[PDB]
Amino acid sequence: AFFQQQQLPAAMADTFLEHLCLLDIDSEPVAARSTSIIATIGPASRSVERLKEMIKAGMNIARLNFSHGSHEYHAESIANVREAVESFAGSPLSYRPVAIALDTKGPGSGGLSEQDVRDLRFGVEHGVDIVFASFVRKASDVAAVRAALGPEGHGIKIISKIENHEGVKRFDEILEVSDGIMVARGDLGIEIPAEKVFLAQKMMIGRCNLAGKPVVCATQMLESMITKPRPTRAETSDVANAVLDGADCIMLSGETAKGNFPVEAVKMQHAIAREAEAAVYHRQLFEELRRAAPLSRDPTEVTAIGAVEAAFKCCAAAIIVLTTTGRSAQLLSRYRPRAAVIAVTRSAQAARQVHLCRGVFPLLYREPPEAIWADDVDRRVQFGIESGKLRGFLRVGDLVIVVTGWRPGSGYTNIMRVLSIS
Amino acid sequence: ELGTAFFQQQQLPAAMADTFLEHLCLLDIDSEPVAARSTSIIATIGPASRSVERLKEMIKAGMNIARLNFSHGSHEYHAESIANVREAVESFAGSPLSYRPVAIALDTKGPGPGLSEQDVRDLRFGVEHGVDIVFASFVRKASDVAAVRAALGPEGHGIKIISKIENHEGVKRFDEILEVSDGIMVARGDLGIEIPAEKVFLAQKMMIGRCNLAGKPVVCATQMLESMITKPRPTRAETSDVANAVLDGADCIMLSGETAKGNFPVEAVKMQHAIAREAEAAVYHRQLFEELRRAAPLSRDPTEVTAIGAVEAAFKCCAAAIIVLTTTGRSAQLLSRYRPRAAVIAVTRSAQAARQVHLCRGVFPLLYREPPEAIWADDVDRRVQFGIESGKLRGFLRVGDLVIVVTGWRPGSGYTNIMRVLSIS
Amino acid sequence: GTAFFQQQQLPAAMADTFLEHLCLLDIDSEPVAARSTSIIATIGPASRSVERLKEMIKAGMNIARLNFSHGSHEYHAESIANVREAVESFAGSPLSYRPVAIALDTKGPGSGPGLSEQDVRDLRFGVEHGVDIVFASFVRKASDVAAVRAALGPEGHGIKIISKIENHEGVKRFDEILEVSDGIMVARGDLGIEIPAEKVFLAQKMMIGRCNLAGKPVVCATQMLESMITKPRPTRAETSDVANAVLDGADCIMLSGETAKGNFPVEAVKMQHAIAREAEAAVYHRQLFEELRRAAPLSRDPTEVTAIGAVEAAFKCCAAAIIVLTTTGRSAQLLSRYRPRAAVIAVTRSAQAARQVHLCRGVFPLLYREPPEAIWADDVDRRVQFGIESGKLRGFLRVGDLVIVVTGWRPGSGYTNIMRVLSIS
Amino acid sequence: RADVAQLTQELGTAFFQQQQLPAAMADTFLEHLCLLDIDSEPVAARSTSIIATIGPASRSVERLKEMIKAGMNIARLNFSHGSHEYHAESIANVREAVESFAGSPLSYRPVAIALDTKGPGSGPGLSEQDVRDLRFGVEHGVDIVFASFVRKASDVAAVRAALGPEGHGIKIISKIENHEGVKRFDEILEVSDGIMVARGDLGIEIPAEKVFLAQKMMIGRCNLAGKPVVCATQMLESMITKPRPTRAETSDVANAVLDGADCIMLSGETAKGNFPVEAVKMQHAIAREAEAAVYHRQLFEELRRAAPLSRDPTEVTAIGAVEAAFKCCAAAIIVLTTTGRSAQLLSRYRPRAAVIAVTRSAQAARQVHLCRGVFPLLYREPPEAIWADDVDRRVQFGIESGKLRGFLRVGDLVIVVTGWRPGSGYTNIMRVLSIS
Ligand SMILES: Nc1cccc(S(=O)(=O)N2CCN(S(=O)(=O)c3cc(O)c(O)cc3-c3ccc(O)c(O)c3)CC2)c1
Ligand SMILES: Nc1cccc(S(=O)(=O)N2CCN(S(=O)(=O)c3cc(O)c(O)cc3-c3ccc(O)c(O)c3)CC2)c1
Ligand SMILES: O=P(O)(O)OC[C@H]1O[C@](O)(COP(=O)(O)O)[C@@H](O)[C@@H]1O
Ligand SMILES: O=P(O)(O)OC[C@H]1O[C@](O)(COP(=O)(O)O)[C@@H](O)[C@@H]1O
Ligand SMILES: O=P(O)(O)OC[C@H]1O[C@](O)(COP(=O)(O)O)[C@@H](O)[C@@H]1O
Ligand SMILES: O=P(O)(O)OC[C@H]1O[C@](O)(COP(=O)(O)O)[C@@H](O)[C@@H]1O
Ligand SMILES: O=C([O-])C(=O)[O-]
Ligand SMILES: O=C([O-])C(=O)[O-]
Ligand SMILES: O=C([O-])C(=O)[O-]
Ligand SMILES: O=C([O-])C(=O)[O-]
Ligand SMILES: [K+]
Ligand SMILES: [K+]
Ligand SMILES: [K+]
Ligand SMILES: [K+]
Ligand SMILES: [Mg+2]
Ligand SMILES: [Mg+2]
Ligand SMILES: [Mg+2]
Ligand SMILES: [Mg+2]
């Protein structure tokens, strides 16, 4: 029964063609949904009660579109998101962090606009986790956004939105200085021929997967759901194909910001992503990611590939990793393990930000500290296990891979352990 | 010999990649498609696309197959649609560069436990009006196909039956249905109501893969460019859906309300044409050919053996085309199953085979009407040169190009056993 | 039948990985195909008798090597005459006649920088006596090959030059030497004295790989069955060395003292024949063909394009043979470079090309002696039938087998362009 | 180039020219062959063990010290000839030569002692002489038995029973020497610790032209099973009288290593020949060249793909450690082992990194020479009070011994494999350490 679920006959196929032939509509997904959902906040999704339903439906990142609304409007949206998120903090083993992303208005006819400088400063003052920078055309646009965030916004992730021909042509220099990329298909489909957008999307997703940096697929994914309760056949296919392409995140804009079915749109993206993740051909994907990733002398990078290889060898239910900044979890995520990456962290911001990386399930550690560091590490690992049991990730008898470091502080991950549950 | 400009077009840097991941990383929006569009477009005929003048514009835009939806309209209404399609197609007989065959497909209303009384009458109408294809609605098992085959009376055994898979039972009994069908249609409209909407992509990808493995045509259908019923431009999900159906391996793509009742029927056909051309150049032939080759069983059938040899030869020299002589379309279908990058130019004397081969990806039919030569080898040579000269006229070929030519050792269908490498003079 | 798929290591051939291929090798799986790696036997006092030479031809000797490091011109002229008398004693039965090439192995430069005066005289002797091949000793650079070619003069343009790589400089300048040579000999005797003995296997494997990539013949030579100079059976290391030279990709294997001066010349030829047949069935064609195909560059030469198409067609139908008509041997060499499992039966009127194609693995030359038919198409068909009738008599073919036939569109060398699937009747 | 560019700038172009690294980075086996270079020098320690047969040419203590220095890892006693008194003296001379280097625990070289049985002869099973010779082996503490003419699983059970309760730790390597042994290979390997391709008798029992098929098949199946396989007989035969081997002999040694053999053997070459030390030196030189020419890219991929999924933590840690070692070009994998099993499971994936096995068992240190790429270090210190400190001391002993021996350099990365509790069977940890 285990080998009939989660498209396991298709996963064991020797060729991609045979993998397709073995896909089964009766093979139910069992793993937790790994592709994060970004929902745009607006009039249809601003109330605290509506936001609680969206969190339950699967929203991981709340997007605030600074192209519309005042600073007062966006501050109220942030407060409502935080109130809805903290309403579930009473059960720390099931609490779900939700990131807050600021999407800039853009340069317009201009580099960095004066309104963007003010909006970026608002973001730093209100503690946003991510910036989706509109119309990034070159590396200096990213440096300008970074400078506008100042010293107090050093930890904010900058996701560059590629929306025109120049952004596509200068992609390599933009990705090098960005934390990740958004394939902003709305403007891209107006700036370049509509029939070429899929090429730009597939290329950028492939390059981001190669670089190990998050990539978001955005705009008109479930467009018809703005007025209709069910999406079109092209819309469900688009969501599934963005996941199969290798996108870390999928997004909803008008579907959640102004549409009549914001919760249903989140539920639909969740349902499709789960089905598409099980249909991923890990046999070739892992082989290619492994082969393309360069040789490294960084112990976090070396431990990460060793841990993902170990996870596939034993069909590990999860890889539990301790992380301060999210980096050790990101390096595991880049190899696309089938095992869920359960990231235990004390940083509330890192817990929100790792939603950008596919297959990373953040757990915010709020248990009392231990006097001996080795005991404190072990307790964080046991917390990962208990949260995993409660959420359905783990059961007694499962094998897990545990990734830790040799001393406190970020940058010292160097250990991988094979543990039997209970 | 060919130049650096040649190797920058049609996604050739992405085509030469050693891994699928590197192939994706090398896809270039500035690399323009050069090859003729190989995925056929099926357009549904209705009030928005019925007039002879509108049909001429749809043929020019790229429509290869006209679909008549027998769920609506009388026999008199459909007979007039057939006459208007034939009048629009024959209006281009004066120009060899613009004349192109267009198949006529009858889509049945559907079942009741099996074949309905209306379907028996509509299938009889199809035989009497010389339709080329039947898109059989709600096929659930092999006996449904046998009932459609029996209803095609004594005169319609040459009509192709494309089984529409629209429910859970059709998906589960897919192998037995494909075995007795000429091809399959992934009818996503009803499929998305009969099974959970989030599972349709799995059924589509599975059925396309199995049809590619069997070497039988597969159609992707319904809501591909839905928003174009009222809007002049499609959504980002719609262009992605069309491109991904081609990348999945679909032989044909379809338009329903977009061309039958919408405000932009011609623009919807133009959009499918533009996307299909871009997506065909983005196909990773290096792995696709290797897997089709490895999965296809060993064969002692000379047509099957010649076809793989010809496709291998075409890839070796970057052949501009594979010219094949075919009476039933079968030799062209066996070339098409290996997905060559070279266009398969099929020269035939059968008007029906010329229309029907539009079901097979990459097959460009040429109807030959010259009087037969007394010496059979001379008649073969005349047809081969007719393919070469039509290719030069349409932009497929130029002097100095290499072409692969597929023929048999004697007249009559079933004897394909020869592959030749020719330099165009 | 199941019995067919148990022989010639077919379970090991169908394996998905090289490791599983090794695990499936079976000592009870008997070889069925004809031995494809040519045997070169050095002529000397143990192998000069016309009667002894007839036994060596029957045992499998394909090329007779004359070592010009020993003996006078009178001694070598007598060896040539005895070889030709033994070879022509079988010419009365043209369907079974086996051509045998004559190769002249030069003394070398000695302490000199280039072509020695003795080599100039020996090369002129070779041209005057009609030798087919020259094994040029101690080739260190491209200009050494040009000097050998100039010493052969205008009458020796058809002689094949196989460069012997015997020292560090020859290994380092391998690419420039191979470019101007017809092929290479890994002359392990001197190589194992010029470079550390423990590094010879690296030079052998590298040169064989580069010759296979270039599609040019490579010979593995020296001490392959050394102990058989005095003992009736070879050592375990010797049988392993012969098998591994075949698995490495060598076109030819050689015997020196084993046939020139030893007590078991015929048994040494029989031993190389037996090992080579076993090792050829153990070749993992699944990966080898894929890699040769992928590494071979794109080509606009129709002979090259027809050759890959024919080898692909042969693997698709498990063809017993590829019958090719050839004037110079080139069309057979281009088929041989893809290492088909099917025997390449090369039918030629050139007695010299029939002898020289033994340098290419898997090429079985048939010398056609009939004068040309008045109708060229009939002359082509008669030669193909001669290939089939010889193939039946020799055990290559049976009624019911499929064969690939490779021909050209006009008389004369350089116009091969046709591949055809034929059933043996 | 992008997959090695950062490491090329850091380690240098000279690093990537040695140990056949251009051939190792090739995308196909054909390109790997084309890139093999006679000027690319081997850098790694020799991983394929050398078994030398002891006889009149190699019996003296002084000659044995030279053979240990030349690279002999296993001493073979052929019980087809000589009395029990003769073999006991050979064992004592081997032990005296081995213990002459014990003064420096950081360098000492353990040498295994293997007893090769006379065989069944015309009998159907275990002979009476074999029962007595096997009891002699247990009494004299031999590490391995090379069991002659194994034809079925019951033959190895008979050898195991003849070793008694005191010989439970002795490794049984079954010699496959006839058609029945080849046909019943799977049942024999299942109950054996390893296999010897005994080509001498095999080449007489089956056609000589088929021996290479049996050798390649048995090596492949042993590699798949993760059990040691020995290639034996006439590898350097001409060196019995000549100082240099033939071209076929060097090729045979190189191809046995490329086939996947864990051990290579010398019989008359060391037992009675005029050049026993030179024969060991020649096998050492060829094995190092051939090990660098192994195409690890496909070999590791195929071993990984063919090995079934496992829930054994030692097996899971081993694959993770070998993958980590390839990712960083690790100089070594240091493993703590009681029985040798954790080192054997690392060895089955054929890492390029040396497997330095730290053990307190003198017998396990001798026996791990059967596994390719395992370098045994015998730890003699008494246990620390805190188990975690004792584990750390053993890891540091491996690192310090490794640096002092040129296996590790400052700046190198090493992978360290340990367990969560004392005793055999609990290996479950992999660590990445930087050498300072
Ligand atoms: N991102 C991503 C990165 C790496 C690997 C992978 S992989 O393992 O999943 N897969 C590789 C094979 N390719 S393919 O193009 O060689 C193809 C081959 C067929 O034999 C066929 O029949 C259809 C296809 C095909 C092509 C494009 C598609 O989008 C598609 O759905 C199928 C598909 C992706 C994904
Ligand atoms: N000529 C030639 C050219 C192309 C292909 C071929 S091929 O198909 O026959 N070949 C496949 C690759 N392997 S391998 O090297 O990846 C290897 C893998 C194993 O799984 C194993 O068990 C041992 C080996 C092995 C064997 C020989 C070597 O030199 C070596 O380095 C490793 C070699 C054989 C031959
Ligand atoms: O992923 P990051 O940011 O590098 O953090 C990983 C770090 O977490 C740890 O496992 C635990 O560190 P702390 O005890 O400081 O939380 C370290 O050993 C390791 O260096
Ligand atoms: O694809 P099909 O229907 O089998 O037709 C292929 C046939 O066409 C030919 O090439 C030409 O035949 P005709 O002259 O009868 O048209 C035959 O030799 C071959 O058998
Ligand atoms: O292999 P080569 O030397 O190019 O010879 C192949 C030639 O043999 C033929 O098949 C027959 O030619 P001939 O009739 O002159 O012998 C030609 O059509 C072809 O060009
Ligand atoms: O390789 P083996 O025989 O399983 O031994 C590995 C064992 O060695 C250790 O690393 C150390 O154990 P000891 O302290 O008993 O020597 C254990 O944790 C582990 O189980
Ligand atoms: O800004 C965006 O998100 C877009 O244009 O798609
Ligand atoms: O009938 C159809 O085309 C459908 O249901 O998609
Ligand atoms: O000349 C030769 O053949 C040699 O040196 O091996
Ligand atoms: O017994 C042996 O060692 C042999 O036969 O090779
Ligand atoms: K915005
Ligand atoms: K209908
Ligand atoms: K000579
Ligand atoms: K013995
Ligand atoms: Mg935008
Ligand atoms: Mg329907
Ligand atoms: Mg020489
Ligand atoms: Mg023996």
Short mmCIF file of C-alpha atoms in Angstrom, two decimals, chain B residues 204-313:
data_model
loop_
_atom_site.label_atom_id
_atom_site.label_comp_id
_atom_site.label_asym_id
_atom_site.label_seq_id
_atom_site.Cartn_x
_atom_site.Cartn_y
_atom_site.Cartn_z
CA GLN B 204 -3.34 14.18 -19.58
CA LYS B 205 0.40 13.50 -19.10
CA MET B 206 -0.16 9.75 -18.67
CA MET B 207 -2.36 9.40 -21.79
CA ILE B 208 -0.01 11.50 -23.92
CA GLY B 209 2.96 9.38 -22.78
CA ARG B 210 1.16 6.09 -23.51
CA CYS B 211 0.01 7.32 -26.96
CA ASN B 212 3.60 8.42 -27.78
CA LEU B 213 4.81 4.93 -26.66
CA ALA B 214 2.15 3.22 -28.85
CA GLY B 215 2.84 5.53 -31.83
CA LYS B 216 -0.81 6.66 -32.00
CA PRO B 217 -2.10 10.26 -32.25
CA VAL B 218 -3.18 12.11 -29.10
CA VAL B 219 -5.20 15.36 -28.95
CA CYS B 220 -5.14 17.82 -26.04
CA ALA B 221 -8.53 19.54 -25.80
CA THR B 222 -10.74 22.11 -23.97
CA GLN B 223 -10.21 25.53 -22.35
CA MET B 224 -6.69 25.89 -23.83
CA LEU B 225 -7.34 29.57 -24.71
CA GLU B 226 -10.78 29.93 -22.98
CA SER B 227 -10.50 33.66 -22.13
CA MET B 228 -10.12 34.39 -25.89
CA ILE B 229 -13.89 33.69 -26.24
CA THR B 230 -14.38 37.36 -25.09
CA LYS B 231 -10.81 38.83 -24.92
CA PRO B 232 -8.34 39.46 -27.81
CA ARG B 233 -5.34 38.18 -25.76
CA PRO B 234 -5.10 35.02 -23.63
CA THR B 235 -4.02 34.71 -19.99
CA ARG B 236 -0.48 33.64 -18.90
CA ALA B 237 -1.88 30.25 -17.79
CA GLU B 238 -3.46 29.70 -21.24
CA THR B 239 -0.26 30.27 -23.27
CA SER B 240 1.59 28.03 -20.77
CA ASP B 241 -1.09 25.31 -21.19
CA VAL B 242 -0.73 25.28 -25.01
CA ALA B 243 3.10 25.18 -24.80
CA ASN B 244 3.04 22.43 -22.15
CA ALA B 245 0.60 20.26 -24.18
CA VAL B 246 3.19 20.35 -27.05
CA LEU B 247 6.09 19.67 -24.62
CA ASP B 248 4.05 16.78 -23.06
CA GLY B 249 3.97 15.18 -26.56
CA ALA B 250 0.52 16.00 -27.99
CA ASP B 251 0.10 15.49 -31.73
CA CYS B 252 -2.83 17.95 -31.92
CA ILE B 253 -4.17 20.87 -29.93
CA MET B 254 -7.82 21.98 -30.05
CA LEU B 255 -10.09 25.04 -29.85
CA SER B 256 -13.80 24.66 -28.93
CA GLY B 257 -15.81 27.77 -27.83
CA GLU B 258 -12.77 29.90 -28.86
CA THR B 259 -13.53 29.23 -32.53
CA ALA B 260 -17.16 27.97 -32.47
CA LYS B 261 -18.83 30.91 -30.69
CA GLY B 262 -16.19 33.41 -29.48
CA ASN B 263 -15.40 36.93 -30.74
CA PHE B 264 -11.81 36.13 -31.85
CA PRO B 265 -11.81 32.73 -33.70
CA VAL B 266 -9.01 33.67 -36.14
CA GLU B 267 -6.85 35.23 -33.39
CA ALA B 268 -7.27 32.05 -31.26
CA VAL B 269 -5.94 29.92 -34.17
CA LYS B 270 -3.05 32.41 -34.71
CA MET B 271 -2.16 32.24 -31.01
CA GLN B 272 -2.08 28.39 -30.97
CA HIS B 273 0.08 28.47 -34.13
CA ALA B 274 2.58 30.96 -32.59
CA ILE B 275 2.87 29.06 -29.28
CA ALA B 276 3.16 25.59 -30.90
CA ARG B 277 6.04 26.76 -33.14
CA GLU B 278 7.95 28.13 -30.11
CA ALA B 279 7.27 24.99 -28.02
CA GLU B 280 8.30 22.57 -30.78
CA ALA B 281 11.75 24.20 -31.01
CA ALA B 282 12.06 23.86 -27.18
CA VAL B 283 11.54 20.05 -27.34
CA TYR B 284 14.60 18.18 -25.93
CA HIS B 285 15.03 15.76 -28.87
CA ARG B 286 18.28 14.30 -27.47
CA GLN B 287 16.47 12.54 -24.59
CA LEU B 288 13.07 12.18 -26.32
CA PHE B 289 14.51 10.27 -29.31
CA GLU B 290 16.71 8.13 -27.03
CA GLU B 291 13.70 7.15 -24.89
CA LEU B 292 11.31 6.56 -27.83
CA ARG B 293 14.05 4.42 -29.45
CA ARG B 294 14.75 2.46 -26.22
CA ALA B 295 11.06 1.94 -25.32
CA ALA B 296 9.92 0.89 -28.82
CA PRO B 297 10.21 -2.90 -29.06
CA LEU B 298 12.41 -4.64 -31.63
CA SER B 299 10.61 -5.15 -34.93
CA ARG B 300 10.83 -7.29 -38.02
CA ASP B 301 8.37 -5.00 -39.94
CA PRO B 302 10.38 -3.25 -42.69
CA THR B 303 8.34 -0.01 -42.43
CA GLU B 304 9.14 0.26 -38.71
CA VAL B 305 12.85 -0.60 -39.34
CA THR B 306 13.13 1.90 -42.24
CA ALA B 307 11.42 4.62 -40.18
CA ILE B 308 13.93 4.49 -37.28
CA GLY B 309 16.86 4.36 -39.73
CA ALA B 310 15.46 7.40 -41.61
CA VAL B 311 14.89 9.48 -38.43
CA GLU B 312 18.43 8.58 -37.20
CA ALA B 313 19.83 9.62 -40.62
#
